[PDB]
Design an enzyme around this catalytic site. Structure first.
Site, PDB file in Angstrom:
ATOM      1  CD  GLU A  23     -31.003  23.787  22.210  1.00 39.61           C
ATOM      2  OE1 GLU A  23     -30.897  24.722  23.056  1.00 39.61           O
ATOM      3  OE2 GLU A  23     -30.646  22.620  22.491  1.00 39.61           O
ATOM      4  CG  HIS A  80     -21.312  19.180   4.166  1.00 34.96           C
ATOM      5  ND1 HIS A  80     -21.899  20.361   3.689  1.00 34.96           N
ATOM      6  CD2 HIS A  80     -20.594  19.502   5.292  1.00 34.96           C
ATOM      7  CE1 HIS A  80     -21.541  21.352   4.514  1.00 34.96           C
ATOM      8  NE2 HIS A  80     -20.775  20.845   5.465  1.00 34.96           N
ATOM      9  CD  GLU A 100     -33.871  24.188  25.759  1.00 35.48           C
ATOM     10  OE1 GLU A 100     -34.818  24.150  26.561  1.00 35.48           O
ATOM     11  OE2 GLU A 100     -32.768  24.737  26.042  1.00 35.48           O
ATOM     12  CD  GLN A 118     -14.988  25.273   8.619  1.00 36.23           C
ATOM     13  OE1 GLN A 118     -14.445  26.412   8.806  1.00 36.23           O
ATOM     14  NE2 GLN A 118     -15.057  24.714   7.447  1.00 36.23           N
ATOM     15  N   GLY A 119     -19.435  24.493  11.449  1.00 37.56           N
ATOM     16  CA  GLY A 119     -20.481  24.328  12.481  1.00 37.56           C
ATOM     17  C   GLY A 119     -21.748  25.060  12.163  1.00 37.56           C
ATOM     18  CB  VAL A 131     -27.890  26.587  29.275  1.00 37.05           C
ATOM     19  CG1 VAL A 131     -28.800  26.764  30.487  1.00 37.05           C
ATOM     20  CG2 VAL A 131     -26.467  26.954  29.625  1.00 37.05           C
ATOM     21  CG  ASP A 150     -18.074  33.395   5.100  1.00 40.31           C
ATOM     22  OD1 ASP A 150     -19.192  33.052   4.620  1.00 40.31           O
ATOM     23  OD2 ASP A 150     -16.974  32.911   4.677  1.00 40.31           O
ATOM     24  CB  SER A 151     -21.851  30.894   7.374  1.00 42.88           C
ATOM     25  OG  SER A 151     -21.673  30.499   6.046  1.00 42.88           O
ATOM     26  CB  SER A 178     -22.245  22.876   7.628  1.00 45.13           C
ATOM     27  OG  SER A 178     -21.026  23.403   7.064  1.00 45.13           O
ATOM     28  N   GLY A 179     -25.350  23.401   7.008  1.00 42.29           N
ATOM     29  CA  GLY A 179     -26.711  22.909   7.081  1.00 42.29           C
ATOM     30  C   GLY A 179     -27.747  23.871   7.475  1.00 42.29           C
ATOM     31  CG  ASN A 204     -26.205  28.542  26.198  1.00 41.98           C
ATOM     32  OD1 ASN A 204     -25.648  27.492  25.927  1.00 41.98           O
ATOM     33  ND2 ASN A 204     -25.525  29.528  26.852  1.00 41.98           N
ATOM     34  CG  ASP A 234     -24.009  20.169   0.914  1.00 42.16           C
ATOM     35  OD1 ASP A 234     -24.381  19.113   1.474  1.00 42.16           O
ATOM     36  OD2 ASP A 234     -23.193  20.994   1.415  1.00 42.16           O
TER      37      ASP A 234
HETATM   38 CA   LIG Z   1     -30.656  25.179  25.217  1.00 41.50          CA
END
Ligand SMILES: [Ca+2]
Length: 223
Positions: free
Chosen positions: A52, A40, A62, A174-175, A57, A171-172, A177-178, A54, A84
């Site tokens: 990653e 999804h 990264e 929105q955002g 920033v 909980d987890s 996901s995955g 932050n 999914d």
């Molecule tokens: Ca960063």
């Protein structure tokens, strides 16, 4: 992640952020070339961001690597969220190091009651909205199949499990996901769905990764 904690920079080195101009989903690095995420979370135009902490920033560890290919499961059903799961191939291999590392795929399915690590940059509020910049973490137990089915009658397949706290508050969301659900050092779940976040009697529902290991292995052997 609602009710979690700040992980600590690069302590979850397999966590990725999927970016299409902005963070929109998590994923897990399973080898230098491949990420596992939720179907999804499919979008065209994905850049994988590894290393990653932050996400707003550039801190110095990264790796930003475009996807070359995304492969939604052949039996994904976006109505029920059965199957999914998605694979994302990187255009170039990540350089693996102490802060960018793969997570093992499971051999066996995890057990009810096992405490797992769930992580992400998703919303931190059950009521309302606040997105963190740094990665958040939560330890949550796998619930029994009977409890999960009682929470979401007629909605849980054998490719899903619940994890979390039926009293609410953790909980987890929105955002997230995955992103990963790691249990005994292996990727056992993908953040998939739930009714709201951290609400009483509505735990998170996660893709059961142990059901997909043969698909993952044959797909990565072939792409
Ligand atoms: Ca960063």
């Amino acid at each position: 992640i609602v009710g979690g904690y700040t992980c600590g920079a690069n302590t979850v080195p397999y966590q990725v952020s999927l970016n299409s101009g902005y963070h929109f989903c998590g994923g897990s690095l399973i080898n230098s070339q491949w990420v596992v995420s939720a179907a999804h979370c499919y979008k065209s135009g994905i850049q994988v961001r590894l290393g990653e902490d932050n996400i707003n920033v550039v801190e110095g560890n990264e790796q930003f690597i475009s996807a070359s290919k995304s492969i939604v499961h052949p039996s994904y059903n976006s109505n029920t969220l059965n199957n999914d799961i998605m694979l994302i191939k990187l255009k170039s291999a990540a350089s693996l190091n102490s802060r960018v590392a793969s997570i093992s795929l499971p051999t066996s399915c995890a057990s009810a009651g096992t405490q797992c690590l769930i992580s992400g940059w998703g919303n931190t509020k059950s009521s309302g909205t606040s997105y963190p910049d740094v990665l958040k973490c939560l330890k949550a137990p796998i619930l029994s199949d009977s409890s999960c089915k009682s929470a979401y009658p007629g909605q849980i397949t054998s490719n899903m499990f619940c994890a979390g706290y039926l009293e609410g508050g953790k909980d987890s969301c929105q955002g997230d996901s995955g992103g990963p659900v790691v249990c005994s050092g292996k990727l056992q779940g993908i953040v998939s769905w739930g009714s709201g976040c951290a609400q009483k009697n509505k735990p998170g529902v996660y893709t059961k990764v142990c059901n997909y290991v043969s698909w993952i292995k044959q797909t990565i052997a072939s792409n």
